[PDB]
């Protein structure tokens, strides 16, 4: 439950690998940003662990306690089924928080690709700004990083997601909801 600097590989991923992942994230963002929730959902693997701990203000001495843990509450801590119900809710004619829907942009940069022991599975670090605009005048700006495990897959995106941890740059949430996906 303590994160620290991402352990980038010493030799960078080849130019092909870096591009493929990058393009995967840009495709991902287009799906989300255009509310194609179902096609987004289809990216998640059976074993998915979608996680986003709480952060707290800690004195330096108590820095190893910055993030919430596995036996604590999170903003998200999901599996395929819990993700499906969330998907189910957000697409509902009668789910008010997203009818009318929001307007978001997922801006992806800082993509670091690390190869795992398993070929075709990769550990990926990236940074994001998520911009959510809503109702008449509501703007919520989110920032953080994503820690993904991604497998090559034969969907039109070229990858699927096995694990996503989201380090949101927030203690208390400045927004009234998290109706969006990271």
């Amino acid at each position: 439950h303590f994160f620290k600097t991402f352990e980038w590989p010493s030799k960078a991923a080849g130019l092909e690998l870096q591009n493929e992942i990058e393009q995967f994230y840009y495709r991902e963002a287009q799906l989300l940003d255009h509310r194609a929730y179902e096609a987004w959902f289809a990216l998640l693997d059976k074993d998915i662990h979608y996680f986003m701990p709480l952060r707290t203000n800690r004195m330096i001495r108590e820095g190893e306690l910055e993030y919430s843990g596995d036996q604590d509450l999170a903003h998200f801590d999901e599996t395929h089924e819990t993700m499906y119900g969330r998907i189910r809710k957000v697409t509902s004619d009668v789910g008010w928080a997203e009818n009318p829907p929001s307007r978001t942009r997922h801006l992806v940069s800082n993509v670091i690709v690390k190869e795992t022991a398993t070929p075709d599975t990769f550990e990926v670090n990236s940074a994001f700004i998520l911009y959510r605009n809503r109702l008449e005048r509501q703007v919520d700006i989110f920032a953080g990083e994503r820690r993904d495990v991604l497998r090559r897959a034969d969907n039109n995106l070229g990858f699927s997601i096995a694990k996503r941890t989201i380090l949101l740059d927030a203690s208390t949430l400045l927004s009234n909801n998290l109706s969006m996906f990271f």
């Binding site: 709480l54 707290t56 203000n57 800690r58 004195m59 108590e62 306690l65 919430s68 843990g69 036996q71 604590d72 509450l73 999170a74 903003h75 998200f76 801590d77 999901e78 819990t82 119900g85 969330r86 189910r88 809710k89 509902s92 009668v94 789910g95 008010w96 928080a97 997203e98 109702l135 203690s171 208390t172 949430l173 400045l174 927004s175 009234n176 909801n177 998290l178 109706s179 969006m180």
Partner: protein
């Protein structure tokens, strides 16, 4: 300013009318601080938040920040997080452990009791350190939860809670081991007045009975079994307190919208087997049929809200008439099996968090209401609080207290009723039960 006479007219439980101005007047908010928040019993969390000595937790009482710290003698002190020299925040992190509290501005140090025990350069400059410590605030406990209060004149916690205690226990007093708080305090900002948050947990099951959670419901049933066959709960009752504007409400005979809201393993624990019956006998000393009693909501005026069955519990810290912070957390039976403690954590995340399949729709209404109340016209006419007006009994077989139908506004009328009293009656003499 706002005359006692004016305040009285803002609420009327007789005809059932609320002046929409209450959720929006700045003057009424600031008076709410002095007369409601500076004199009430405000939830701070659980004992299990500060187990060891020195263990603290920065939190709030209205718009005053407080340190709730564990003591040498295993008691719990609570004081204003403000060094009386020139104002500085004394304790500057969210949670942790302390042997000392230093004030970074000028050195003035403090101990976990919250007493001023050194002032750098005492003699060359200066005064009695014992009379210049952080304004102390009264502390008390009920079956786990901590509450606090600034006013010496106010009725003790046990008295203040009144006949609401039978209903609180349904969550808390289910074992002699007690409840424990799963670590981590969820926090988010909501642009909406506190009383909607308070009222929704008091009387409003109506929202769940109708439209708000149609999406929440839809989420927890297979792709084969689709919502074109919707079964809405009918039977259940609502509690109004004898005093102090608390309240609760629940369904009876209906494991319907608890199996879909919380999964099987948690229903088959709240309702069936050894651990279920143990609870009924611990508190069946009020005739309480607690095993058939699901989906309860409850508030302890002003701002302690929780869903006993479900176990999420929160304090709405006021941030002006247009804003509140939800500081939520979940509770478990301390002796409960781990698998059920995981099921209680997972579900309080899926359902009652910022991105929660239920909470989202909960906050939306209040969000969208607060926007409307900016207008002159939208504040110039009474709001309809008339559900079950004068229909609630003075006594009931299965449930104590002033008790109505589950879909009603009797608790709500009580809530705004007590709200009005505190705002109009400056002398505790009159207000005490």
């Amino acid at each position: 300013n706002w005359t006692p006479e004016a305040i009285r007219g803002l609420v009327d439980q007789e005809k059932g009318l609320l002046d929409p101005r209450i959720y929006a007047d700045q003057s009424l908010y600031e008076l709410e601080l002095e007369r409601v928040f500076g004199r009430s019993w405000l939830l701070l969390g659980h004992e299990s938040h500060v187990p060891e000595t020195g263990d603290f937790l920065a939190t709030y009482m209205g718009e005053d920040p407080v340190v709730m710290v564990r003591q040498k003698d295993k008691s719990i002190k609570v004081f204003l997080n403000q060094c009386r020299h020139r104002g500085m925040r004394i304790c500057r992190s969210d949670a942790g452990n302390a042997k000392a509290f230093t004030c970074s501005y000028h050195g003035w140090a403090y101990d976990i009791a919250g007493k001023l025990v050194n002032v750098p350069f005492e003699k060359e400059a200066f005064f009695d350190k014992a009379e210049w410590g952080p304004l102390q605030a009264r502390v008390a406990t009920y079956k786990g939860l901590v509450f606090a209060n600034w006013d010496v004149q106010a009725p003790d916690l046990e008295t203040y809670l009144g006949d609401a205690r039978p209903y609180m226990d349904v969550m808390l007093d289910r074992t002699p081991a007690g409840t424990v708080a799963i670590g981590g305090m969820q926090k988010w900002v909501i642009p909406c007045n506190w009383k909607f948050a308070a009222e929704q947990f008091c009387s409003d099951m109506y929202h769940a009975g109708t439209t708000t959670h149609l999406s929440g419901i839809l989420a927890g049933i297979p792709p084969e079994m689709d919502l074109s066959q919707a079964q809405i709960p009918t039977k259940g009752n609502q509690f109004r307190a004898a005093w102090g504007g608390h309240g609760s409400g629940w369904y009876v005979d209906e494991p319907g919208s608890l199996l879909a809201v919380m999964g099987p393993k948690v229903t088959q624990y709240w309702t069936e087997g050894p651990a279920a019956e143990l609870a009924e006998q611990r508190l069946g000393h009020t005739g309480m049929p607690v095993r058939r009693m699901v989906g309860q909501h409850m508030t302890i005026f002003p701002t302690c809200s929780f869903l006993p069955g479900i176990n999420t519990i929160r304090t709405w810290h006021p941030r002006g008439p247009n804003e509140i912070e939800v500081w939520a957390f979940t509770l478990v039976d301390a002796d409960a099996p781990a698998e059920i403690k995981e099921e209680y954590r997972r579900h309080n995340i899926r359902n009652f968090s910022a991105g929660g399949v239920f909470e989202q729709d909960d906050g939306e209404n209040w969000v969208e209401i607060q926007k409307g109340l900016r207008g002159y016209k939208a504040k110039s006419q009474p709001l309809n609080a008339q559900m079950g007006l004068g229909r609630s009994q003075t006594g009931h077989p299965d449930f104590p207290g002033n008790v109505g139908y589950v879909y009603a506004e009797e608790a709500a009328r009580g809530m705004y009723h007590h709200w009005m009293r505190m705002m109009s009656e400056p002398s505790w003499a009159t207000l005490k039960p």
